[PDB]
Ligand SMILES: C[C@H](CCC(=O)O)[C@H]1CC[C@H]2[C@@H]3CC[C@@H]4C[C@H](O)CC[C@]4(C)[C@H]3C[C@H](O)[C@]12C
């Protein structure tokens with residue numbers, strides 16, 4: 100996994116969330132990938148990951164990187180914002196994500212870390 104590829108994957112992830120391209124998001128993940136979101140138990144496998152992002156995309160998510168991606172030794176991490184409006188109220192969440200890649204270049208472990216203080220009205 101080159102740093103260029105892992106960085107491009109982060110970009111394609113951010114772009115697929117923006118397009119609502121659920122297939123495009125899921126295609127980045129290994130069939131047995133595990134995703135850990137703050138405040139929930141982890142979920143594993145294509146079906147669960149697709150269901151998480153489908154429910155997430157019920158919101159009009161606008162996403163963008165806020166710093167350069169960090170990529171080395173089969174892993175990447177990135178800082179970003181997700182903005183949405185729901186029932187007329189605007190929220191911006193600022194996580195840090197971490198992706199771990201398998202030899203085939205697919206995400207096999209992903210984490211989103213965010214707290215109360217990173218959820219802004
Ligand atoms: C309960 C709070 C509002 C609390 C508050 O305003 O103080 C709101 C804020 C964001 C809302 C969620 C946004 C995404 C989803 C939209 C769906 O159409 C209904 C379920 C979800 C999961 C909503 C559930 C719930 O309606 C939430 C969590």
Ligand SMILES: C[C@H](CCC(=O)O)[C@H]1CC[C@H]2[C@@H]3CC[C@@H]4C[C@H](O)CC[C@]4(C)[C@H]3C[C@H](O)[C@]12C
Pocket residue numbers: 136155181192194196210211213218
């Ligand atoms: C879909 C992104 C990105 C996930 C990732 O990169 O791993 C995540 C990051 C922050 C997430 C939000 C955090 C606060 C809320 C938690 C609720 O229980 C469900 C709706 C909300 C509004 C979440 C919706 C969605 O799950 C978000 C917007």
